[PDB]
Design brief:
part of a larger assembly, 3 chains, A mainly alpha (about 180), B alpha+beta (about 120), C mainly beta (about 260), B: about 120 residues, alpha+beta, Alpha-Beta Plaits, 5-stranded antiparallel beta sheet, about 25% strand, elongated, C: mainly beta, Structural Genomics Hypothetical 15.5 Kd Protein In mrcA-pckA Intergenic Region, Chain A, OB fold (Dihydrolipoamide Acetyltransferase, E2P), 3 domains, globular, RNA-binding, Ribosomal_eS24 (chain B), diamond-blackfan anemia (chain B)
Chain lengths: ~180, ~120, ~260
RNA sequence: UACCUGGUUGAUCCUGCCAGUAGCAUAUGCUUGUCUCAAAGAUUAAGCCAUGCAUGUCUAAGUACGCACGGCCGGUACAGUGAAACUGCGAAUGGCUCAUUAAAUCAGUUAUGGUUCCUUUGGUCGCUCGUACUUGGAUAACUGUGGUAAUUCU
RNA sequence: UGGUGACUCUAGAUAACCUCGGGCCGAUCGCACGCCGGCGGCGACGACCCAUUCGAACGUCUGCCCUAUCAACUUUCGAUGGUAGUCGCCGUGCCUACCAUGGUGACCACGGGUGACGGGGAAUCAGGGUUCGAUUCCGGAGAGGGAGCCUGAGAAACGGCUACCACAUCCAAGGAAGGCAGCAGGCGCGCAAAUUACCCACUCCCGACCCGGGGAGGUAGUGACGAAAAAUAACAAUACAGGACUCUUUCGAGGCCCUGUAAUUGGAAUGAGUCCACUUUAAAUCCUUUAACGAGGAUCCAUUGGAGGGCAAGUCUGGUGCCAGCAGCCGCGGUAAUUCCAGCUCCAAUAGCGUAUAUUAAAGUUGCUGCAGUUAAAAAGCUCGUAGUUGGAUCUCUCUCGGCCGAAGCGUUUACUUUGAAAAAA
């Protein structure tokens, strides 16, 4: 007997057909457009979207006044509009089935750093976040997969210790200054 | 900037004769503040001696902003020596642990198990 | 398998204790006492987890062995002492008195009472029997025996006990129209007025209860504890008045409170 | 994501299986920079085991004429600390393994009005019509004499 | 007296009895003060009896894998029942004496098998299912195999004893001593699994106990079982390439945007690593934090399988020549080999990928949903017939005491449906 917890789960699904040309092209389009590292990030976002769709599809078979349908559907919709994937105007259970993978990929911190102009390209945004240059509110965030909530969008600064936003030159600049 | 101390979840525990609190330490560009400096700061903040203030469990947040730990200010030093874990006392030089390892004690006990009477004192 | 067990696994401990799953393998196995193992709260859980006066079980021992804790007027130095329903926990050093009343979620709430109300308690009588040359005895849910009870007190009634003397000062009969709290099952912690009792000879009687907000539920006869006469409770109720809120109502109330205060 | 594809023929439509395809769990091969959580002698051998450890325990409150320490007046009965030993409690919990086991174990349900219950908790405990200002004998620890190659022997 | 649905319950009364191996009514200890030889307050410990606190034990109802190449089984060795007892803590063929001849079975008894401990549960799964569950929670069982016991509230206990069987140890051969399916570790087995480490600081447990102990448990070491996050580069100037959601009689200005083995050049960014002080923690045992150094082939160099089809991606070049080999399947190879051995290039996943085996989906190839039986595998030669399965139409407030309901009762029963109660957590 141990005080440890063995609860864990896989966060992606490997596709059934490994060599579908259209699937490969679409996944490469997503990777290139959003600057992802491998197909596992695409499959992870696919898995989260599939689980959300599955919950919505199950809740849509219940009666429209079933208290569990009301509670759980309202919670799911509030969560979906919290991270900005779903517009609050479209807050019915049937609009969850209309969401795409790119809506969830848009909310990534990599995409948001690229969009807010802190980076010149999406890959630059990835290397920026991974190099402790980007902070959300007051917290330095190293994870490009960080899904930014709506209330957190307005606060994505350039860190208070990063050379680009905080005012301490890095190793390269300091060495070049010491050369002269 | 300089180091700042706040005490989040302050409580007065009369049952152990102390005040227990959660300590937030703002050190925006420094290493995690040594426990001794935090103890001096708490002594200044609470108008007492830093010898009745025991602080522990300090975790620094990712990114280097602040540190969060627990602290306890005792009513007196004897109440501290009575209510404190021995290791937190030894961190102040008020307690010294035994030198022998577990193995030595266990083998000595089993050796004495094989003799009867005052000869037990003659083992080891 | 031979003789009694002395350990309680953390995941096998009662859920209403609200214990973690990563703080060790074991849970405090409550000592034998007035209340059942699953229907109690060890003193260590109350002092360390609820009141948070102690950070570890060793500090609970340090508190208890100073004799700062009394339960039903008696100084208890056992950190696994089972304190159960209606029990009064007195801490004279901090001058605070608690009563163990179930929260609507079926958990022991940290409920503070006045020193005037800490002088008594309510006890559900479990049996009445005549013994030992005609002396009638009454046994309550505290497993405490009282000789010479009032002849009108029968089983399932509720007696008020003066803790200092332990003698019955008053009682409420188990009758339709008397306030009661549910002490077991799904309706645990709910408070309402008794409205019906369908008797099933040879099996469990079912008591119907109507909540102050109009909600009606049912329970077994062994799960009813009469609090007061009529709609008026004889003890101070917890923060919630025994009215269970649906999860939708709970979410709405939480959101409204957040909007109102912050 | 309620999915199929190659293969019998000169060619065709089928039956039908083989092969592919994805997860999962063991072993293995090649390769491996960071960080978190985490399984791990189950399968074959419930096969065999060197060595060490894994169960002991004293409060103001059972028994202290061990100076083994110890001082305050020390023929103050017992200052006190305290090894040993007698006494009490525990050692029936925990941990391991899955050999046996097919209404057996087990699960849910119910019963003990058909039983036992250390401990905890609350009661009862002058209810008995005939030296008590305190009775008896051992025995450990301790001292001393040994036996056996050998033991937690005596 | 009181209670239950129900006592041969509880309480009461009477005549007695009370185990040589009789049972209850305290010869016990500490701390504080106290008033006439007074009377005392606060505890500790110990009896007896009652009170499911914790249980244990033993019963009820329903549910358990394959097998008929197992169809009858049990009744001397109690089988089913009845009466009296014995034993047991108690109910009971638990055992005994006597009597009866019963009890189970195609609704699968009995026997056999099980790489069978049961369940919570796990993998997979549209719906339906199929496999798995030694494994940390609950229950059971065992401590080499059997058997028998002591002590005790509790054990048929094995880190208790007694004996036999198997194995094995020391011996001065007279004797003595064993039990890792506890934690490490060793041998053996095998395709198959880690350190003879630190600590009781946490969680709890035990004890006379605030103090002692705990290979329970924690903490580290080994760790590509597995799971999560996530580097191996970003930007710009400079050939050039193309378009041109920009301007012009093809032309061209393409910095008006986006690529590009360019080992071009340029400055920025940073962590892998080494190191320092903290912090962590029982003990720096990592992560986090600060600081020093730390990238141009950023040599600080990503691999594992493939390139005919299935199936993504070369009938390019060199070698071999039905050889060597490849190839899950179809197939390649006998002188242009799209398939072998290699170079280059390409693509799939990527700190991971290939292989063997078991299993799930695929499998509507086990079909309840949901398959088939003229000829592809398949309807018995034919009829009768007991279990089994299925079975035509019909049939439109239950009385009381207290005559506002504060209040009733027996209304033919089942299945079905809805509800309610109760139902460990993980």
């Amino acid at each position: 007997p141990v005080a440890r917890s063995w609860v864990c789960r896989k966060t992606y699904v490997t596709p059934r057909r490994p060599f579908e040309k259209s699937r490969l092209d679409q996944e490469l389009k997503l990777i290139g457009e959003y600057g992802l590292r491998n197909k596992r990030e695409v499959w992870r976002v696919k898995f989260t979207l599939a689980k959300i769709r599955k919950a919505a599809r199950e809740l849509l078979t219940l009666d429209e006044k079933d208290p569990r349908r009301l509670f759980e559907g309202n919670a799911l919709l509030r969560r979906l509009v919290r991270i900005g994937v779903l517009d609050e105007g479209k807050m019915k259970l049937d609009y969850i089935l209309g969401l795409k993978i790119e809506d969830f990929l848009e909310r990534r911190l990599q995409t948001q750093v690229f969009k807010l102009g802190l980076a010149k390209s999406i890959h630059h945004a990835r290397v920026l976040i991974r190099q402790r240059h980007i902070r959300v509110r007051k917290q330095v965030v190293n994870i490009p997969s960080f899904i930014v909530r709506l209330d957190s969008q307005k606060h994505i600064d350039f860190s208070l210790r990063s050379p680009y936003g905080g005012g301490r030159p890095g190793r390269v600049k300091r060495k070049n200054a010491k050369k002269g | 900037d300089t180091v700042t101390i706040r005490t989040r979840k302050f409580m007065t525990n009369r049952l152990l004769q102390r005040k227990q609190m959660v300590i937030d330490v703002l050190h925006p560009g420094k290493a995690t503040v040594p426990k001794t400096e935090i103890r001096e700061k708490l002594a200044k903040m609470y108008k007492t001696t830093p010898d009745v203030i025991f602080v522990f469990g300090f975790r620094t947040h990712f990114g280097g902003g602040k540190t969060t730990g627990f602290g306890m200010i005792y009513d007196s030093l004897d109440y501290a020596k009575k209510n404190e874990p021995k290791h937190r006392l030894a961190r102040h030089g008020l307690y010294e642990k035994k030198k022998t390892s577990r193995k030595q004690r266990k083998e000595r006990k089993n050796r004495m198990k094989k003799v009867r009477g005052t000869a037990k004192a003659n083992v080891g | 398998a031979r003789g009694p067990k002395k350990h309680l696994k953390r995941v096998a401990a009662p859920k209403h204790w609200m214990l973690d799953k990563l703080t060790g393998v074991f849970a405090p196995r409550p000592s034998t006492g007035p209340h059942k193992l699953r229907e109690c709260l060890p003193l260590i859980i109350f002092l360390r987890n609820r009141l948070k006066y102690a950070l570890t079980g060793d500090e609970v021992k340090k508190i208890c062995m100073q004799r700062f804790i009394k339960i039903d007027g008696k100084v208890r130095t056992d950190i696994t002492y089972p304190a159960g329903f209606m029990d009064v926990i007195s801490i004279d050093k901090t001058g605070e008195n608690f009563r163990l009343i179930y929260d609507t979620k079926g958990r022991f709430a940290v409920h503070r009472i006045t020193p005037e109300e800490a002088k008594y308690k309510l006890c559900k009588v479990r049996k009445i029997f005549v013994g030992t040359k005609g002396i009638p005895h009454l046994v309550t849910h505290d497993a405490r025996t009282i000789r010479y009870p009032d002849p009108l007190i029968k089983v399932n009634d509720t007696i008020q006990i003066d803790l200092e003397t332990g003698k019955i000062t008053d009682f409420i009969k188990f009758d339709t129209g008397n306030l009661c709290m549910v002490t077991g099952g799904a309706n645990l912690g709910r408070i309402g007025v008794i409205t019906n009792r369908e008797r099933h000879p040879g099996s469990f009687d079912v008591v119907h209860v109507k909540d102050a907000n109009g909600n009606s539920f049912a329970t077994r006869l062994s799960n009813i504890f009469v609090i007061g006469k009529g709609n008026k409770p004889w003890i101070s109720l917890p923060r919630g008045k025994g009215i269970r809120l649906t999860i939708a109502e709970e979410r709405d109330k939480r959101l409204a409170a957040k909007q109102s205060s912050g």
